[PDB]
Amino acid sequence: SHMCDAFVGTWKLVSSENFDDYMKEVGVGFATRKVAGMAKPNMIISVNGDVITIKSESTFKNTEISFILGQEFDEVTADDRKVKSTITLDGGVLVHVQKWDGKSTTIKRKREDDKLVVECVMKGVTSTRVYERA
Numbered sequence: 001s002h003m004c005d006a007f008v009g010t011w012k013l014v015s016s017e018n019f020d021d022y023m024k025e026v027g028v029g030f031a032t033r034k035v036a037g038m039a040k041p042n043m044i045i046s047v048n049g050d051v052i053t054i055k056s057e058s059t060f061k062n063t064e065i066s067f068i069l070g071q072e073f074d075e076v077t078a079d080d081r082k083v084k085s086t087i088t089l090d091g092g093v094l095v096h097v098q099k100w101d102g103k104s105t106t107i108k109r110k111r112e113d114d115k116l117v118v119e120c121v122m123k124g125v126t127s128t129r130v131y132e133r134a
């Protein structure tokens with residue numbers, strides 16, 4: 001057993017707050033905000049050795065990242081930003097920092113009760129997205 005065992009599995013979105021405002025702060029345009037804000041993704045997290053894979057599947061976009069903790073990678077986000085990403089585990093929280101164009105956003109994922117809680121921060125704006133097991 002290991003690092004991310006309590007994250008592994010298939011998760012479904014059950015609530016979202018302030019996501020449109022988070023996307024505005026990130027610079028996402030109107031039409032993408034509308035369609036992405038409507039999405040109800042399933043998030044699939046798996047581990048194989050040191051490599052963690054996170055898939056997001058929805059009617060809007062399907063994305064996949066694979067990474068090693070602490071090791072930067074280039075990522076194309078669902079909204080088509082080209083970012084440099086680093087994901088670490090800090091006190092049991094997966095912390096995902098994305099850098100692009102002199103900007104930065106941080107996505108934190110944590111287990112709380114039977115939920116996986118995702119907090120997305122861009123400057124002063126936070127969005128909270130709650131997932132349950134599928």
Ligand SMILES: O=C(c1cccc(Br)c1)N1CCCCS/C1=N\c1ccccc1
Binds near residue numbers: 039058107118
């Ligand atoms: O993995 C997704 C993802 C993938 C496919 C669909 C959707 Br909806 C979300 N993330 C990262 C997790 C935290 C939410 S922000 C985000 N992507 C977006 C960022 C800006 C605008 C639109 C989507």
